[PDB]
Amino acid sequence: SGFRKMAFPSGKVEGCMVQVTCGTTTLNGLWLDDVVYCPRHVICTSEDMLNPNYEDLLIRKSNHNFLVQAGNVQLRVIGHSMQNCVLKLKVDTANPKTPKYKFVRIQPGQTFSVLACYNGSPSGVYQCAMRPNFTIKGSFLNGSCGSVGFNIDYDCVSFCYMHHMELPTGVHAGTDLEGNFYGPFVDRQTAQAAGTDTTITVNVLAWLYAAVINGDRWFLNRFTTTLNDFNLVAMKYNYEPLTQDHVDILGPLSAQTGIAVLDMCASLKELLQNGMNGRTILGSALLEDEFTPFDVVRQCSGVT
Amino acid sequence: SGFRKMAFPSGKVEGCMVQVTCGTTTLNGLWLDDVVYCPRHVICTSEDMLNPNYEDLLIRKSNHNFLVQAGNVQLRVIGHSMQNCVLKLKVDTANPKTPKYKFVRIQPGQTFSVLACYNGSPSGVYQCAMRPNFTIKGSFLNGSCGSVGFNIDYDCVSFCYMHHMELPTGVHAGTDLEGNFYGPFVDRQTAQAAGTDTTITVNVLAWLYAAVINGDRWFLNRFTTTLNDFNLVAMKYNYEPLTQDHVDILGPLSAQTGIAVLDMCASLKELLQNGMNGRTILGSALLEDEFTPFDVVRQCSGVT
Numbered sequence: 277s278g279f280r281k282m283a284f285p286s287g288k289v290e291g292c293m294v295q296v297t298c299g300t301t302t303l304n305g306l307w308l309d310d311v312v313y314c315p316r317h318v319i320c321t322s323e324d325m326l327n328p329n330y331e332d333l334l335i336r337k338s339n340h341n342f343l344v345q346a347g348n349v350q351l352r353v354i355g356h357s358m359q360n361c362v363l364k365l366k367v368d369t370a371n372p373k374t375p376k377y378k379f380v381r382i383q384p385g386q387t388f389s390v391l392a393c394y395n396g397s398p399s400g401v402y403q404c405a406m407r408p409n410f411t412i413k414g415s416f417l418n419g420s421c422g423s424v425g426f427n428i429d430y431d432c433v434s435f436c437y438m439h440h441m442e443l444p445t446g447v448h449a450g451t452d453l454e455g456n457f458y459g460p461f462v463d464r465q466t467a468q469a470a471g472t473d474t475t476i477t478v479n480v481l482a483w484l485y486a487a488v489i490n491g492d493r494w495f496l497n498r499f500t501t502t503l504n505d506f507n508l509v510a511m512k513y514n515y516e517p518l519t520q521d522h523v524d525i526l527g528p529l530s531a532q533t534g535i536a537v538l539d540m541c542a543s544l545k546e547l548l549q550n551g552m553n554g555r556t557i558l559g560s561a562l563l564e565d566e567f568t569p570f571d572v573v574r575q576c577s578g579v580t
Numbered sequence: 581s582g583f584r585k586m587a588f589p590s591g592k593v594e595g596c597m598v599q600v601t602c603g604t605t606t607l608n609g610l611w612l613d614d615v616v617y618c619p620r621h622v623i624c625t626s627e628d629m630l631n632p633n634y635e636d637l638l639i640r641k642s643n644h645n646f647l648v649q650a651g652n653v654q655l656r657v658i659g660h661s662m663q664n665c666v667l668k669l670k671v672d673t674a675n676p677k678t679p680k681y682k683f684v685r686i687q688p689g690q691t692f693s694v695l696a697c698y699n700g701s702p703s704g705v706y707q708c709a710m711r712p713n714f715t716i717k718g719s720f721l722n723g724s725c726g727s728v729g730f731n732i733d734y735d736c737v738s739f740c741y742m743h744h745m746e747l748p749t750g751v752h753a754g755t756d757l758e759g760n761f762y763g764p765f766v767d768r769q770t771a772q773a774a775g776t777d778t779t780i781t782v783n784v785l786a787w788l789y790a791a792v793i794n795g796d797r798w799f800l801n802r803f804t805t806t807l808n809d810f811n812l813v814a815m816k817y818n819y820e821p822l823t824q825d826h827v828d829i830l831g832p833l834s835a836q837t838g839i840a841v842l843d844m845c846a847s848l849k850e851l852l853q854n855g856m857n858g859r860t861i862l863g864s865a866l867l868e869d870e871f872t873p874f875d876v877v878r879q880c881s882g883v884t
């Protein structure tokens with residue numbers, strides 16, 4: 277019993293972290309096989325960040341300008357290339373600690389763990405969701421760029437995020453491991469609109485199922501609703517509209533609890549219209565949307 | 581910016597996890613140097629747990645009855661001894677992945693990370709606090725016994741908790757690494773009173789300082805209070821009384837923000853008396869007490 281915002285064990289990722297330095301800028305890199313991946317803005321000075329011409333900036337750099345250090349040992353850089361907003365530094369040594377891995381582009385509303393790093397050294401691990409507006413509400417300070425987000429399935433690490441930037445609003449933006457930003461962001465020091473965010477409806481429903489499994493049941497009511505009726509409410513409260521694809525992924529939780537998905541939607545509808553009345557659900561006084569249906573089943577039934 | 585319930589990177593601990601099996605019972609063990617540590621109830625069957633005579637049960641066991649497997653490789657057990665509620669299985673091989681470590685008994689109100697494990701395999705990591713009543717509000721299923729709690733300071737893992745039991749109320753109890761339970765608990769299947777819990781006042785104040793550092797400031801008011809006045813309020817709301825030792829550990833956060841500790845106590849006093857009025861602080865609608873003053877400074881200013 278109990279329900280926590282749980283991250284994947286970070287060991288497999290810790291073994292991949294390196295420090296990358298170019299000129300006077302230092303950030304984190306990810307060393308997998310014989311390639312180190314890092315944000316391309318490692319080649320910028322503060323003066324360059326207003327509007328960097330990354331192609332021109334990178335032309336001034338040679339392999340020997342990228343200093344890559346794995347703990348205390350130095351990696352020899354034998355090639356460099358820019359792919360979208362990431363640099364890929366070919367090194368002469370395959371990382372002996374490379375886990376089985378994949379690069380994936382996650383969908384908005386999915387979750388992942390972040391290993392925050394500074395100077396190539398891991399500092400902490402936390403779980404978060406990719407917001408519907410493609411920002412993440414992380415915890416990152418200067419020096420965290422190049423930290424990565426990931427999911428783990430048995431022995432395979434699926435890397436989905438590399439941290440690049442903190443927006444003026446304090447939320448975070450980054451790329452997949454091919455250097456493509458999530459969302460409309462560009463790697464330059466300008467104010468950039470994130471756009472309207474929404475609450476991840478299917479995750480709130482998943483977490484209400486987690487609450488019932490863990491014994492918090494005060495919010496279950498005698499009502500039901502339809503997808504159309506529930507979606508009128510979701511619109512009013514800035515929640516994502518629920519689709520049959522979301523109902524389908526909630527099937528396992530619906531079977532575990534015996535609570536039909538539309539009956540749980542009626543409980544969520546009443547919580548949205550009445551609030552929590554000073555009560556709590558799984559130690560929260562707000563409706564939580566950072567647990568997917570897969571996360572809930574993994575945490576409530578077991579997976580290692 | 582941002583503020584998350586961050587755990588230490590778990591890699592150093594993942595390397596220590598093993599599976600321990602005795603008869604038909606399997607749980608987790610911690611392999612440090614040439615010793616594996618695990619809950620002594622690995623020697624019990626379900627019939628024994630009502631009131632086990634651990635001494636008599638252990639006398640029936642020999643070294644060859646404890647099966648210890650580190651991933652896929654088997655460890656040879658060459659000695660066994662019970663210390664309080666833990667077993668210590670001497671093995672013929674020092675764990676090559678043993679990090680620098682210490683065993684510490686944490687104080688109530690302190691925090692630590694938990695690496696939840698099943699069958700010696702790490703499944704997730706989360707941060708939590710040792711409650712003032714010596715329980716932890718973890719997330720653990722059957723098979724999680726032997727999972728450990730820890731803190732990391734640079735390269736040293738300080739192990740503070742080993743998971744033993746879930747109480748009928750769904751909260752958790754365990755021991756230090758010398759097998760001494762935190763709190764009044766005994767390792768037997770009986771209903772056991774945890775006793776009145778309280779909110780960790782100094783951590784709530786630390787988290788209000790984290791909120792101000794991150795830009796959530798709506799709760800700052802034009803008031804101040806005294807320790808005596810604040811403590812009348814803390815009593816009414818079941819918070820721990822604040823002492824000068826707590827004020828002293830809040831000094832760094834008070835200097836960082838320029839907000840005198842007693843002025844922050846007046847903000848906490850008003851939040852306790854008026855509630856949050858439908859507002860949030862650091863994405864929470866409740867007052868958070870699982871961040872110590874050390875945690876806040878580590879997360880807001882940096883430490884790897």
Ligand SMILES: CN(C(=O)Cc1cccc(Cl)c1)c1cncc2ccccc12
Pocket residue numbers: 317325416417418419420421440441442443462463464465466581
């Ligand atoms: C280094 N950094 C940047 O945003 C730098 C940057 C500025 C502009 C564009 C890009 Cl692509 C990168 C940061 C990242 N995360 C969190 C930060 C907290 C405080 C200070 C800077 C933080």
Ligand SMILES: CN(C(=O)Cc1cccc(Cl)c1)c1cncc2ccccc12
Pocket residue numbers: 277621629720721722723724725744745746747766767768769770
């Ligand atoms: C295995 N276990 C025990 O409490 C066993 C036990 C029972 C009685 C006393 C002791 Cl010392 C141990 C558990 C631990 N954590 C969480 C649990 C969730 C569900 C089912 C059991 C869980």
